[PDB]
Amino acid sequence: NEGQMRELQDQLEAEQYFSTLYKTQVKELKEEIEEKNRENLKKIQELQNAAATLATQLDLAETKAESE
Amino acid sequence: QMRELQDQLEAEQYFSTLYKTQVKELKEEIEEKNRENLKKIQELQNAAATLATQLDLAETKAESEQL
């Protein structure tokens, strides 16, 4: 009977180990995802800047053309 | 008592499984993102191409109308 107990306890310690391990894996991945979203957003913002200049030059060309 | 210990073991087992499944979901999500990004960048490239071509034609025309 004490054997059953000892074995169950062993099992429990094992699963505590794995449970913890994967619990941290999740955390890491969540962090990684958040980083990727941040970085992605930043790069899109840079693209938007790059496009803005074109848009303005065309705007001013257009209105300037619309005066003459 | 050891029924308590059985229950606790099974709760832990539940959690280990749960976390493994969550990891697989998240890895999936990451891959899908890496796909979607790629695709969208390519779409942007296509959309820029047209403007590029029109500008090229324009620049030729402007150079040629010169005196």
Residue numbers in the entry:
A (entry chain D): 835 to 902
B (entry chain C): 838 to 904
Share the article's original sentences.
Vertebrates have two highly related Rock proteins, Rock1 and Rock2, which share 65% sequence identity to each other. Both contain an N-terminal kinase domain, a centrally located coiled coil region and C-terminal pleckstrin homology (PH) and cysteine-rich domains. Rock catalytic activity is inhibited by a direct intramolecular interaction between the kinase domain and sequences within a large C-terminal fragment of Rock containing 200 residues of the coiled-coil region, the PH domain , and the cysteine-rich domain. To accomplish this task, Shrm3 is localized to apically positioned sites of cell-cell adhesion in polarized cells, where it directly interacts with Rock through a highly conserved domain on its C-terminus called the Shrm Domain 2 (SD2).
Together, these data suggest that there is a stable Shrm binding domain (SBD) composed of residues 834–913 of hRock1. Crystals of SBDSER belong to space group C21 and also exhibit anisotropy with diffraction extending to 2.5 Å along a* and c* but only 3.1 Å along the b* plane. Phases were determined using the SAD method, and the final model was refined against native data at 2.5 Å resolution to Rwork and Rfree values of 23.6% and 27.6% respectively. The helix is noticeably kinked after the SBDSER positions suggesting that the substitutions at the SBDSER positions may have altered the overall structure of the SBD to favor the formation of a helical bundle between residues 875–902.
